[PDB]
Design a protein around this ligand. Structure first.
Ligand code: HEM
Length: 94
């Protein structure tokens, strides 16, 4: 039906290059690997954001109510509860 796969910052961060363009959004992990070109906005912005925060960019943009469901298709795992208690807070920002 679906499950997560709680992954840590480091693990996710490794999955940025070549063949696993993962990202953290809101408080959970997405794969956008095949989505790269499909993404009606551009690859490059994703690849820049790859294994970094990209919600902070997405949210300002305010993605469509459709992407909101499709997101749950791209979802890979959740943000491990380890770092969660920290989220050594990017001090801000957007
Ligand atoms: C890594 C985080 C993401 C960033 C930084 C990002 C950024 C962008 C940008 C800059 C655009 C173009 C907006 C414009 O030209 O005005 C866009 C459009 C779009 N994105 Fe993303 N995106 C992200 C993740 C996603 C995901 C996961 C999905 C699918 C759930 C998605 C679905 C879409 C759709 C449907 C559009 C078209 C919006 C429209 O023109 O109506 N994006 N995105």
């Amino acid at each position: 039906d679906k499950d997560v796969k709680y992954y840590t910052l480091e693990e996710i961060q490794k999955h940025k290059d070549s063949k696993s363009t993962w990202v953290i959004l809101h408080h959970k992990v997405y794969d956008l690997t095949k989505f790269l070109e499909e993404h009606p906005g551009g690859e490059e912005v994703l690849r820049e954001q790859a294994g970094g925060d990209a919600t902070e960019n997405f949210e300002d943009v305010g993605h469509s109510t459709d992407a909101r469901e499709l997101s749950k298709t791209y979802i890979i795992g959740e943000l491990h509860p380890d770092d969660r208690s920290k989220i050594a807070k990017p001090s801000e920002t957007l």
